Design a protein around this ligand. Sequence first.
Ligand code: CLA
Ligand code: CLA
Ligand code: CLA
Ligand code: CLA
Ligand SMILES: CC1=C(/C=C/C(C)=C/C=C/C(C)=C\C=C\C=C(C)\C=C\C=C(C)\C=C\C2=C(C)CCCC2(C)C)C(C)(C)CCC1
Ligand SMILES: CC1=C(/C=C/C(C)=C/C=C\C(C)=C\C=C\C=C(C)/C=C/C=C(C)/C=C/C2=C(C)CCCC2(C)C)C(C)(C)CCC1
Ligand SMILES: CC1=C(C/C=C(\C)CCC[C@H](C)CCC[C@@H](C)CCCC(C)C)C(=O)c2ccccc2C1=O
Ligand code: SF4
Ligand code: SF4
Lengths: 64, 82, 82, 49, 154, 42, 138, 81
Amino acid sequence: IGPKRGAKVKILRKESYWYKGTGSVVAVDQDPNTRYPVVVRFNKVNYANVSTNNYALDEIVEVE
Amino acid sequence: LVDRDPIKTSFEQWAKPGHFSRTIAKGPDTTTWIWNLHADAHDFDSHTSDLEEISRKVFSAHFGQLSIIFLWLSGMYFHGAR
Amino acid sequence: LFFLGAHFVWAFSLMFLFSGRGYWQELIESIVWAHNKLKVAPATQPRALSIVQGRAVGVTHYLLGGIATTWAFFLARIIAVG
Amino acid sequence: DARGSKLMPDKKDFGYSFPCDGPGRGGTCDISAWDDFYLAVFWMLNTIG
Amino acid sequence: DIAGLTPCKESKQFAKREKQALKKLQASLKLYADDSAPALAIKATMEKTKKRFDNYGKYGLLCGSDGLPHLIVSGDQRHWGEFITPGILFLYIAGWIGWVGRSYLIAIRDEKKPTQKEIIIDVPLASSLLFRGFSWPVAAYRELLNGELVDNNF
Amino acid sequence: MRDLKTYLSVAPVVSTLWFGALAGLLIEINRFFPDALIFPFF
Amino acid sequence: ELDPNTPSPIFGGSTGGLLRKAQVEEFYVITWDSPKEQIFEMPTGGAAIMREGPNLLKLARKEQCLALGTRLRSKYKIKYQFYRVFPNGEVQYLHPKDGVYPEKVNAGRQGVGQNFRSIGKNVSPIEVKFTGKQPYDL
Amino acid sequence: MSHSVKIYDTCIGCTQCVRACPTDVLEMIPWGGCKAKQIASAPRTEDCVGCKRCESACPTDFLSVRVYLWHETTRSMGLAY
Ligand code: CLA
Ligand code: CLA
Ligand code: CLA
Ligand code: CLA
Ligand SMILES: CC1=C(/C=C/C(C)=C/C=C/C(C)=C\C=C\C=C(C)\C=C\C=C(C)\C=C\C2=C(C)CCCC2(C)C)C(C)(C)CCC1
Ligand SMILES: CC1=C(/C=C/C(C)=C/C=C\C(C)=C\C=C\C=C(C)/C=C/C=C(C)/C=C/C2=C(C)CCCC2(C)C)C(C)(C)CCC1
Ligand SMILES: CC1=C(C/C=C(\C)CCC[C@H](C)CCC[C@@H](C)CCCC(C)C)C(=O)c2ccccc2C1=O
Ligand code: SF4
Ligand code: SF4
């Protein structure tokens, strides 16, 4: 803490069910290492019984 | 489930979000389930694995109908008398 | 005065009987969109009919439609001459 | 959206007549731009009536 | 006045409608309640549609042919409140259906989890919200255009 | 017993004591003025 | 078929199971381990008792063996084999090949996944209209 | 294509997730890590029919999957026979 990890993130791949609606982050990766880190969550559910899905730093874009 | 099992609540559950199949109605919201449940209010896959009661439920539902015909048709017989 | 409705309800069944499902979804969102702009929808994820529910709302209507049609057609040709 | 939407993001490279898809997601059906054309032709047979 | 023939003051075709029809529903010579206390064609059902009369009100009211009334609703002559009078009324009532729609809704999403409050309904009709709707003067009619729901909320 | 900032709940269809009734009181205005099709004012 | 009875697995008769084009195409028999003799569900409306082995009944089409399999591992055991027979023996050898129980690694085989590009924005349409210069055939 | 319905996701982990499907899928290939790191959309698919039982369970997080080969076998049909 003292930069920010999971405050609030919009989503913009334009497949994501949530897409824009901007909700919940979670334990986003501490690596240099891959291309699909970041969990996120929001309550607006989605098309499957369970959705909370993981998204990566491209782009991915704002808040701001 | 556990609002609170067995021995120690008389206290009824009305509330906390309610029931079926184990990833039970989510918490998180949907419409379909309001259509589920009128449908397949009894199927008897669920409520218990073990027939146990149900025969102990279907005798009661039967009673309700016999009354009801009766509520009926008093009505009818009324109507017919007065 | 029934014979038109229920001779309508039937000819409403086909809509429920003859149609897709992610269709009224695909539609239900355009809706859900317009809804969010004014801030008036999301909570209780509004969802289209449960493939087989849609069939449940065929059939059932196709019958209480196509049937009372004659329940009318009949009581109307024995009351009065016959 | 013959190009397609949320319930289908993909729905493409056959855009038109791919009629049907698997059950699950919400339950998915006459959601090809053909089956809306398919669905359309009932009201063109109801107006034009 | 505008084409369908004119009001009550004369609409013969209309007159003929008054008369045959109801007056015959009469024309069951009797069917007998010479005292009798129940059967009510007799009194009103006619008379309640019947002591409709060279009066109805008066109401103007256009009476096409067959002397059934047609409603122009122009802003003229007699006819203004066959749409506006009961038009703004429709508007006012609705919108205070949904002003509170956009209310026993924008009051939750909040605190500790609100995932289906909505299917039981604390307080019913919101009520509290309810009266907001008559106590709209202006209400949305400026606040919707500025602030709150505001273009940003757009 | 209910003061300020929303109150107690209610069931699935209290709409069936809202279609029936409230709305019901309205026939009750459609016989007081047994008729409409325009209306005088007050 | 008397002069050779090889049989391990025990129906009696049914209307069910394979009719002629299993001979003219591709054959599809499944085989297994067993403990002590039990009475089973089938494909094809039902049922039989097993004992032992080869324990090598043959089925119509591949969906049917695997289908027991679910069938066969509730009520358990490890060991189920399903092979594909022709008329004319081999190629396409079906459960034998490496390991079994998909959900392990030795190797890749297979699959890719992506074609040329990944899931993201095919909002982009199909492109050049089929010519035999550009990599559109895999 | 001759069976091309994308169920891919990102985790391609398969524990309390998805297995269901008559033969078609051997996966568990790994790809050089993803958490659980069993990846890909598929094993070689010229074997079985066209379910979407393929998701129904364990994410695809774009498209569902479905009918579409077109180019259609008999063995891939169910009926020849
Ligand atoms: C003596 C037997 C009787 C009994 C005791 C049962 C009992 C049962 N049936 Mg059943 N059934 C019966 C006769 C009976 N059935 C008959 C004659 C048929 C042929 C039509 C069926 C067809 C049937 C099906 C397809 C199913 C069942 C299922 C069930 C189970 C689910 C019950 C439920 O949730 O209610 C369901 C009732 C509703 C959800 C109420 C909706 C009723 C609508 C359609 C209204 C009907 C039209 C009417 C004119 C509307 C009122 C007027 C209106 C216009 C104002 C239950 C164990 C279900 C199951 O899954 O098994 C476990 C399955 O759905 N039944
Ligand atoms: C929304 C649609 C549009 C409309 C307005 C209609 C309307 C109609 N179609 Mg129709 N149709 C359409 C699109 C439409 N269609 C399309 C796209 C197709 C496919 C091409 C069809 C295929 C079709 C067929 C095959 C038929 C119709 C028929 C009908 C008519 C039935 C007669 C009637 O209603 O008398 C009007 C009078 C009344 C409704 C009086 C109502 C009084 C009663 C019901 C009481 C008051 C209501 C109360 C709430 C009911 C009690 C319920 C209570 C328990 C709450 C009706 C005019 C049928 C017909 O009659 O001839 C073709 C015929 O079956 N349609
Ligand atoms: C009270 C309302 C709420 C509000 C503010 C709106 C508002 C809107 N709806 Mg809508 N809708 C609602 C509930 C609401 N809806 C419900 C419950 C349904 C059933 C699924 C729909 C089904 C629906 C469809 C199909 C469409 C709309 C559309 C619209 C938009 C066009 C207005 C119109 O002509 O539709 C008139 C409104 C209706 C037909 C809705 C009827 C239900 C109302 C009477 C709910 C009444 C309040 C309810 C009892 C809440 C309880 C009160 C609570 C606080 C205690 C507008 C933004 C249209 C659109 O997308 O274009 C922008 C589209 O046509 N709605
Ligand atoms: C443009 C419109 C139109 C349409 C779409 C309809 C549609 C309908 N009418 Mg209808 N009708 C119309 C114009 C129309 N009508 C007109 C102008 C009139 C004159 C007033 C009527 C007078 C009328 C009456 C009196 C009745 C209907 C009924 C019906 C309904 C029966 C159809 C059905 O659902 O089962 C399909 C029906 C059948 C397969 C059986 C009917 C065929 C009969 C006539 C002869 C075949 C029997 C023969 C011995 C061999 C049997 C073969 C067997 C395998 C079926 C249907 C909703 C009736 C109803 O309630 O039906 C249940 C009621 O009988 N209509
Ligand atoms: C005079 C007159 C007229 C005229 C008309 C016109 C000219 C038209 C138009 C109109 C229009 C042009 C419309 C539109 C507008 C726009 C808009 C934009 C609107 C809006 C709105 C909204 C948004 C709403 C909302 C709400 C409310 C208010 C209620 C509750 C909530 C809600 C959400 C529902 C007519 C014809 C009638 C006839 C005669 C009379
Ligand atoms: C505007 C509006 C509206 C609308 C209305 C309408 C337009 C209607 C209609 C309707 C129609 C158009 C039709 C319907 C019909 C219905 C029905 C029909 C119901 C029921 C039934 C019954 C009760 C039956 C019985 C029976 C039996 C016993 C069995 C078989 C036979 C019979 C069927 C007889 C309302 C007011 C609502 C709301 C508000 C808005
Ligand atoms: C038309 C149609 C729909 C669309 C039909 C829908 C969305 C019907 C559901 C509408 C509900 C009943 C409206 C409920 C809203 C009110 C109950 C809420 C307010 C409460 C009141 C006081 C009015 C399908 O979902 C479908 C699914 C599968 C096969 C065919 C079809 C099909 O033909
Ligand atoms: S179903 Fe999806 S998430 Fe599950 S293992 Fe396969 S690819 Fe991964
Ligand atoms: S149903 Fe789909 S996923 Fe399953 S094996 Fe067949 S093609 Fe593969």
